[PDB]
Amino acid sequence: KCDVVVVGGGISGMAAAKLLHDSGLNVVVLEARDRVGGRTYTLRNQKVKYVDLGGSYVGPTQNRILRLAKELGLETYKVNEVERLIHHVKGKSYPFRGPFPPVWNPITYLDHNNFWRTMDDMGREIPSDAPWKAPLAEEWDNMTMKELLDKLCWTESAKQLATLFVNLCVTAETHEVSALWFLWYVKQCGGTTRIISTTNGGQERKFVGGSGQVSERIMDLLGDRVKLERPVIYIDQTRENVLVETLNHEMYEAKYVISAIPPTLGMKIHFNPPLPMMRNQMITRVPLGSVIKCIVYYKEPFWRKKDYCGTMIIDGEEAPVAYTLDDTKPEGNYAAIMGFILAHKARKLARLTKEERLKKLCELYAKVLGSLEALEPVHYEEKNWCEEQYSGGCYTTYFPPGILTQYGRVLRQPVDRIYFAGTETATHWSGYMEGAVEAGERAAREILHAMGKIPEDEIWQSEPESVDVPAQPITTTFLERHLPSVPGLLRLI
Amino acid sequence: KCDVVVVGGGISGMAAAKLLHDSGLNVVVLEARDRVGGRTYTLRNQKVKYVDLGGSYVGPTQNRILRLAKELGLETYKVNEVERLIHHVKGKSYPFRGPFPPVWNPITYLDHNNFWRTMDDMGREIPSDAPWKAPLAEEWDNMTMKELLDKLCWTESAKQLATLFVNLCVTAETHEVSALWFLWYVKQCGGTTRIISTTNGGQERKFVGGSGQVSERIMDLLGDRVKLERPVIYIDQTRENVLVETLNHEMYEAKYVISAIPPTLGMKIHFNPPLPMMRNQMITRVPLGSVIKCIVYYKEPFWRKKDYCGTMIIDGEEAPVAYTLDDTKPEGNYAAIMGFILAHKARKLARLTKEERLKKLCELYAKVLGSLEALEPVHYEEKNWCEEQYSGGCYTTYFPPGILTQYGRVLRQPVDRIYFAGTETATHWSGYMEGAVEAGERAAREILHAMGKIPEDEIWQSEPESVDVPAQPITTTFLERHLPSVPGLLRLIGLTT
Ligand SMILES: *[C]C1=C([C])[C]=C2C(=[C]1)N([C][C]([O])[C]([O])[C]([O])[C]OP([O])(=O)OP([O])(=O)O[C][C]1O[C](N3[C]=NC4=C3N=[C]N=C4[N])[C]([O])[C]1[O])C1=NC(=O)[N]C(=O)C1=N2/[C]=[C]/[C]=[N+](\[C])[C][C]1[C][C][C]=[C][C]1
Ligand SMILES: *[C]C1=C([C])[C]=C2C(=[C]1)N([C][C]([O])[C]([O])[C]([O])[C]OP([O])(=O)OP([O])(=O)O[C][C]1O[C](N3[C]=NC4=C3N=[C]N=C4[N])[C]([O])[C]1[O])C1=NC(=O)[N]C(=O)C1=N2/[C]=[C]/[C]=[N+](\[C])[C][C]1[C][C][C]=[C][C]1
């Protein structure tokens, strides 16, 4: 028994556990599996030395995990983006530089340009704070991303790219998801460019040694306080001190509980009293994406000799993987290529043996890169989050049509003495590790204010720009921002 | 410890507990609350005598619950449909007879006609057995019912009626739901007419005294074997006998477990080993509807004197309730009007005090019936399932866009020795009580075949027509089935010639 019990073992949890504890409070972290990273997990073994099988990239805009990571003595390193990149469409590879693949036909350049531009216009109107307050909230929330794309794109080229863009960020199908939501999501990281970018944004760097380290080291900083194998089963706010209880068959009491489960996973616990109605149902409507992350390892980074860094953007159904990044260690060390198997594909491809899938991955790469070499892997590693009981799937939680709108404002409303962290709770970079920190921190601070050691003021707190990962702003073009849409051009005539 | 553990206390479970037990097997029903009715619950108290707060109607098509009901000595009674009915639109009531409200405008008579006609054409094409197998499964599954109506309906009159038709049957918004799914649902009951009808189909009869009876009585036939207050928390197939465990802190073991939790509510349990990928994620994408059931009681059934039985179909937002049935006991006894608060409205009006809601319903009724009398309730009763931890919501589970298609075929794939009941699992009338029976029974039988006391043959079993609720088929009209759509008419117009 203690002061405050935290229900998740992952980054948001620990971040929060620590904040509290750096603050004198007596904390305890109930964590359900033997490891402690979140959807964050770092394999270590001679063949690979280390690989993030969970989440790794981290960037310019993400001032907080950067910071936390530093305090625990960790270091960044940039991802390879020196050579050229590839957009392989209709069976051929086309190389290029810069964040964005070039388009040929004017009546298409116009389209694409409108597409993204429009995503951003549409977002500039959604408070991150609270998406459900947008002038057009409902209209956008009762529509599906596919609907939007269908309405928005006069060219197939664009319709597909956008699909992919989407398949790629969040984890599912243009048809699986609320427009209002997805629109929110992108903006809440600073829009298209920031998010899609390797170099001046989202996927610039990985952490030396693994993002796993983040939470392990906080565990180290915490005493015995972090209890592994402690699936929390049952929470009771009935009396005064709160009781939490473990599948284990032990009890803990405190005067507060932060929960860092991904929202759905709340169903995993039995509450008494019952949750208020909105929450109770909300927990039931907000699932997780599906993805298998895969890493194929070669003797050296053969791509570079062909003046490709290993970034492939790949169009089409026949392809197991649509996006690929270089995963070689910072030293020229373990040549590898990283790749995601998204959404429906993640479920189709699951049935194959690991082996069967490597063949597929390779063959693809050999073809896209154009090099027999890819046919000669030297080691493979993959994780399929789909199958994880205590995670539910990967990257994040998505919102289907009906929902942000109706159940949205509940996600982080406190229930008596339970407050709620978790990346899916953030406001910046939710969905990503940074999110997961802002969350926990904001949470815990909520509890502090409750206990009276701090004002409304200091629940929400600012993000001092890191010095190691400075951020430069986003640039537009008179042309880029006044060319007509395909319709405009039509009306112009 | 025992033979087979069943996880739900509701109709599917009991139905199934029984079947097994009628068969010599050593059963046990772990149920989580003090009661035992499903999303089936019967209030009892002088003011009311009894009222189903949960699910009550039952009808011509539903050959099994009728039957079980009978074996336990229960009796049907038809619901009032002698007087006329009302379609209240744009603020006026229009009375009528027959299951279907009449429409003025031909250019609209045609539309409606096509609307429903289309729903059935569209469903003659989806094997109930396995909806995901339709020639156009995907296309229809990545579409939302709102899209379909939008695409399908050339007239507001129709778009609105249809919307309501949906808000009503399932329990969500045209935009929350998969076309493919909803289509499936309707057809899996035998289509529009069967389903919408009071008299010759869906809502013909209530049981006397309450549906609750059904499951209680089985609990009676069952020994102590039914354990209330036993939230199952944890199920372990690791070894050989399976262990299930209660929040209570006691353990049962068996050689099979039937689960009768509505699917999502699986999450409620910790599995080891972990459920296979698909199931693990499916449990998570398939929620329930939202609805508050409401019953207002009057001195006598005043509407009848006005030659209305109290069936109100009510269009518009300004309305807390869109469908209303007479609930007066079969004797002329407790004058009452039943009504549903659907979908978004369920959540909007939830904030109001019970009181605030009564004023609202009444006022509503007073205007629609046109009768100061309704301003004079003599007692009120209401349930809001939205707030129920061990149910999730009401009538049933719905599938959003992505999903029947992908995670569908798992709903009832067994996992080692866990087999899966619950209405959400049926093939007929799923979503309804009948369903829940077909499920449970079929389930159990699945286990029988496992143990080798029965062949593949007898897992799925047929449905002998009730004598007391005989069923007559669905009737079409040369005209009904050849009038053009508003498009057809358009294309017909060929001034060219
Ligand atoms: C999975 C993943 C992947 C695969 C990938 C990725 C990721 C992921 N990410 C995301 C992250 O990870 C997130 O954000 C985080 O992690 C979250 O965290 P949190 O909040 O904490 O949650 P978690 O972590 O999970 O934790 C949880 C915990 O809890 C526990 N439990 C449960 N239940 C329970 C418990 N206990 C007791 N009782 C009970 N019941 C569990 O177990 C745990 O422990 C990401 N992120 C970042 O940042 N980075 C990266 O990299 C990532 N990744 C990704 C991304 C992708 N991208 C970027 C791509 C792209 C491209 C182009 C465009 C766009 C995008
Ligand atoms: C709710 C409802 C309402 C409100 C209404 C209705 C309904 C309902 N219904 C439906 C029914 O209810 C269903 O189907 C059934 O009941 C189901 O059952 P099952 O299968 O078994 O499931 P349940 O019952 O829920 O059971 C469950 C059990 O389990 C338990 N738990 C949980 N969790 C747990 C447990 N244990 C251990 N552990 C754990 N974890 C619980 O508690 C329980 O016990 C219906 N149906 C019929 O048949 N009828 C009727 O009436 C109904 N209702 C309605 C309907 C409506 N309508 C028809 C209307 C319309 C109009 C026009 C057109 C169409 C429609």
UniProtKB/Swiss-Prot annotation, chain A:
Subcellular location field: Mitochondrion outer membrane
Q: How does it sit in the membrane?
A: Single-pass type IV membrane protein
How might one describe the regulation of this protein's activity?
Inhibited by deprenyl.
Which keywords describe this protein according to UniProt?
Answer: Acetylation, FAD, Flavoprotein, Membrane, Mitochondrion, Mitochondrion outer membrane, Oxidoreductase, Transmembrane, Transmembrane helix
* Keyword hit for tRNA-binding: no
Effect the entry attributes to changing C386A: Complete loss of activity
What GO molecular functions are on record for this protein? Answer: electron transfer activity; flavin adenine dinucleotide binding; monoamine oxidase activity; primary methylamine oxidase activity
SUPFAM superfamilies this protein is in?
A: FAD-linked reductases, C-terminal domain (SSF54373), FAD/NAD(P)-binding domain (SSF51905)
- S-8alpha-FAD cysteine modification, residue list: C394
Q: Which residues form a coiled coil?
A: none
Q: Which domain of life is it from?
A: Eukaryota
One Pfam family matching this protein: Amino_oxidase
Impact noted for substituting H379R: Significant loss of activity
Q: How does it assemble?
A: Monomer, homo- or heterodimer (containing two subunits of similar size). Each subunit contains a covalently bound flavin. Enzymatically active as monomer.
This chain's function reads: Catalyzes the oxidative deamination of primary and some secondary amines such as neurotransmitters, and exogenous amines including the tertiary amine, neurotoxin 1-methyl-4-phenyl-1,2,3,6-tetrahydropyridine (MPTP), with concomitant reduction of oxygen to hydrogen peroxide and participates in the metabolism of neuroactive and vasoactive amines in the central nervous system and peripheral tissues. Preferentially degrades benzylamine and phenylethylamine.
Q: What is this protein called?
A: Amine oxidase [flavin-containing] B
Q: Which organism is it from?
A: Homo sapiens (Human)
Q: What is the lineage of its organism?
A: Eukaryota, Metazoa, Chordata, Craniata, Vertebrata
Gene label:
MAOB
